[PDB]
C-alpha cells in the first residue's frame, strides 16, 4: 500500500523544502545583498522551482555560489523540521478530520 | 526559524495526502463502483484539491459517504508513510547534493 505513496510523498516535500531553502535566502538576500536577491527572483521566474532538479541544474550554469548556498540550507533545513513533521501532521489530521466530520453533522440540523 | 517553515510544510502535507487519498479511492472505486469513480474525478475538476478543507466543505453538499472515506483514509495512509518519511527525505536531499556537487566538480576541471 505505503511505500509506493511514501516515495511519491518524499519527492514533493524535497522539492517543497528546496523552495523554502530559496525562499529564506531570498529574504537574507533582500537585505544583505539586494542584487543577488532580484537576479534569484528573476531566475525563478525563467525556472519552475517545482522541477528541484532542473532548477538547480541551470542554476550551477549562472551562479555557482548561489546553489552551493541552496544545497546547504535545505539539507540543514530539512532536519530541523523532519523531526517534528510526523507529529504534527498527524495531529493536525486528526483534529481536521473531527472538525469535519462534526461540521457535517450539525451542518445537517 | 524551523518552527514557522515546519508548520507551513504540514500544511502543504495534509494536503498532499488528502490528493493520495483521493488518488487511491478512485483506483478502488474504478472496480467496484465505476460510477463513484467517474463522479469522483469530476468533482476534483471544479473543486481544486489543492485547497483540502474548502474542497472536503464543498463535498460534504454533493456526497457524504465518500467524503468520509476521504477523511478515515487519508489518516490512515498518514499512519502508513509518516514515520518513514523523514529518514527518506534526508536520504533523498544528501543524495541530490551530492550528484549536483559532484557534477559542479566535473564542470570546473
Given at each position: 500500500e505505503f511505500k509506493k505513496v511514501a516515495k511519491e510523498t518524499a519527492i514533493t516535500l524535497q522539492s517543497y523544502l528546496t523552495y523554502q531553502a530559496v525562499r529564506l535566502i531570498s529574504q537574507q538576500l533582500s537585505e544583505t545583498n539586494p542584487?543577488?536577491?532580484?537576479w534569484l527572483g528573476e531566475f525563478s521566474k525563467r525556472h519552475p522551482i517545482q522541477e528541484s532538479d532542473l532548477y538547480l541544474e541551470a542554476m550551477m550554469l549562472e551562479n555557482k555560489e548561489l546553489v552551493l548556498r541552496i544545497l546547504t540550507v535545505r539539507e540543514?533545513?530539512?532536519?530541523?523540521?523532519?523531526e517534528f513533521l510526523p507529529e504534527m501532521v498527524?495531529?493536525?489530521?486528526?483534529?481536521?478530520?473531527?472538525?469535519?466530520?462534526r461540521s457535517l453533522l450539525e451542518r445537517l440540523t
Open positions: 542584487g543577488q536577491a532580484i540543514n533545513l530539512a532536519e530541523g523540521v523532519l498527524l495531529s493536525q489530521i486528526k483534529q481536521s478530520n473531527g472538525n469535519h466530520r
